[PDB]
Amino acid sequence: VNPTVFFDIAVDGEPLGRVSFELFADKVPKTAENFRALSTGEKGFGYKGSCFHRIIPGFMCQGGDFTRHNGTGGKSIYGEKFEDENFILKHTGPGILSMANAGPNTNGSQFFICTAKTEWLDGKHVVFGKVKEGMNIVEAMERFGSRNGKTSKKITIADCGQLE
Amino acid sequence: SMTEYKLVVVGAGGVGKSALTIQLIQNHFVDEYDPTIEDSYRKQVVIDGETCLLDILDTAGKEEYSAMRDQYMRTGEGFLCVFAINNSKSFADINLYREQIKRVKDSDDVPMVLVGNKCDLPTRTVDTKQAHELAKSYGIPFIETSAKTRQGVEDAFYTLVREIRQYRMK
Ligand SMILES: CCn1c(-c2cc(N3CCN(C)CC3)cnc2[C@H](C)OC)c2c3cc(ccc31)-c1csc(n1)C[C@H](NC(=O)[C@H]1C[C@@H]1C)C(=O)N1CCC[C@H](N1)C(=O)OCC(C)(C)C2
Ligand SMILES: Nc1nc2c(ncn2[C@@H]2O[C@H](COP(=O)(O)OP(=O)(O)NP(=O)(O)O)[C@@H](O)[C@H]2O)c(=O)[nH]1
Ligand SMILES: [Mg+2]
């Protein structure tokens, strides 16, 4: 059954709120497992302490670079990169959780949370989850973004883990 | 009060638009790849003895977002059209950028410079003789550059400024 994970988001170190996500292991098991394990930290590395480096209001919040903390890094539990598992799931609206990448078959750890329907990303980014609780937290995160994505405060995953 | 010039750097993904701009602005060569969303920089320089203020827009090389280029093409005063000498598709793409600029600005003689980047590389795929011929067909300069070694970087930007200056003196 599909795992649920959470992030506790902070703004310059001050708690903002919790976002939880259902991970669609029933459709993208390999991609869901990567995000689940990175959320628990059980491999010895993962999302805890990392930041949302790119927030563009009207589109998405992107994060997951826990290796370089500059928007260029990240790694998967399978190695540096892994293949696009499938494109069964689509970018249908706010709350969609999907993999960032540098072209075909370059998934690592970077991900994005949609704040709107981004259907032109279908077939380029592997969708693998959706916000359950705390969409209002994701909406609140947009005030810290900008047109090119540069954030005006440090938006971090202060804690993260698995709930179900 | 100094004369201002709005420059826009365009071209296919990965050709070195940001590497060229960052060389001019920050005096270093970005080895890593960090694909651009959109960035703006300001710098004062002296060209042929006249001080001027460059506003430089560094754009994304993402063909799926071509419709988003119109707005910055309307605002821009001169365009660096960049290809890479090891990327034949990027040289083919130049024609599309030139025609989009001409269409969006409704103007036959927008200030432009054709830039062939990555000339430090030990091999290549683009015949630069074709670049000279293309630039001639457009009536614009062709400049070879390497953002890695800084060769030609100042020349590319300053040449575009000279093209804008000549346009304003028409
Ligand atoms: C034209 C201006 N522009 C725009 C854009 C597009 C529109 N449209 C309006 C009309 N509709 C129908 C179409 C779209 C409007 N306004 C803008 C922006 C606000 O104008 C400044 C985008 C964009 C993306 C890139 C470059 C320029 C770009 C880019 C550059 S690297 C990239 N994408 C993909 C990115 N890889 C990485 O980070 C790699 C480095 C790591 C490992 C990636 O996996 N993800 C996840 C998915 C989202 C994507 N990042 C991203 O940030 O998308 C931004 C977005 C705003 C959604 C699209
Ligand atoms: N050898 C060499 N590599 C270069 C040169 N210019 C850029 N590169 C390299 O090519 C890659 C892409 O460069 P970058 O400037 O990011 O390209 P871009 O045109 O801005 N890409 P985008 O459209 O996605 O923003 C980087 O790894 C960079 O170091 C050059 O003159 N020589
Ligand atoms: Mg760039």
Q: Pull the structure tokens for residue B50.
A: 């006249």
Residue keyed to tokens 């704040």: A115
Q: Does A148 touch chain B (CB under 8 A)?
A: yes
CATH code of residue A44: 2.40.100.10
In terms of Cα–Cα distance, which of A23, A19, A76 is closest to A45? A76
Residue keyed to tokens 């919040």: A61
Q: Does B13 sit in the ligand 2 pocket, CB within 6 Å?
A: yes
In terms of Cα–Cα distance, which of B71, B62, B9, B67 is closest to B40? B9
Amino acid at A111: F
What distance in angstroms lies between residue B60's CA and the mean position of ligand 3's atoms? Answer: 6
Domain, as residue range, for A40? 4-163
Please name the residues in contact with A23: beta carbons below 8 A apart, sequence gap of 6 or more. A2, A3, A4, A5, A32, A35, A36, A97, A128, A129
What's the number of domains chain A is made of?
Answer: 1
* DSSP secondary structure letter of residue A51: B
What does this entry list as its resolution, in Å? 1.3
Cα-based angle B66, B72, B76 (whole degrees, multiple of 5): 130
Find the length of chain B: 170
Cβ-based contacts of B37 with chain A (< 8 Å): 54, 56, 148-149
The neighbouring-strand residues paired with A79 are A76
Nearest ligand to residue B20 Cα: 2
Q: Are strands A111-114 and A96-99 parallel, antiparallel or unpaired?
A: antiparallel
Residue keyed to tokens 């280029």: B69
Q: Pull the structure tokens for residue B168.
A: 């304003």
Q: Does B67 touch chain A (CB under 8 A)?
A: no
Residue keyed to tokens 């004062």: B44
Alpha-carbon gap, residue A32 to A80, rounded angstroms: 16
Q: List the single residue in A71, A120, A147 with the smallest CB-CB distance to B34.
A: A71
Q: In what order do the strands lie in the sheet with A127-131?
A: A54-56, A60-63, A111-114, A96-99, A127-131, A14-23, A4-11, A155-162
Please name the residues in contact with A149: beta carbons below 8 A apart, sequence gap of 6 or more. A53, A54, A55, A56, A62, B37
- The 3-state secondary structure of chain B reads CCEEEEEEEEECCCCCHHHHHHHHHHCCCCCCCCCCCEEEEEEEEEECCEEEEEEEEEECCCHHHHHHHHHHHHHCCEEEEEEECCCHHHHHHHHHHHHHHHHHHCCCCCCEEEEEECCCCCCCCCCHHHHHHHHHHHCCCEEECCCCCCCCHHHHHHHHHHHHHHHHCC
Q: Name the 3-class secondary structure at A30.
A: helix
Residue keyed to tokens 């998967």: A76
Q: Name the 3-class secondary structure at A156.
A: strand
Q: Pull the structure tokens for residue B89.
A: 């598709």
CA distance, residue A129 to nearest chain B CA (Å): 25
In A17-149, which ranges are continuous DSSP H helix?
29-40, 135-141
- Residue B131 CA, chain-centre distance (Å), reads 14
Cβ-based contacts of A102 with chain B (< 8 Å): 33, 35
Q: Does B37 touch chain A (CB under 8 A)?
A: yes
Q: Are strands B3-11 and B50-59 parallel, antiparallel or unpaired?
A: parallel
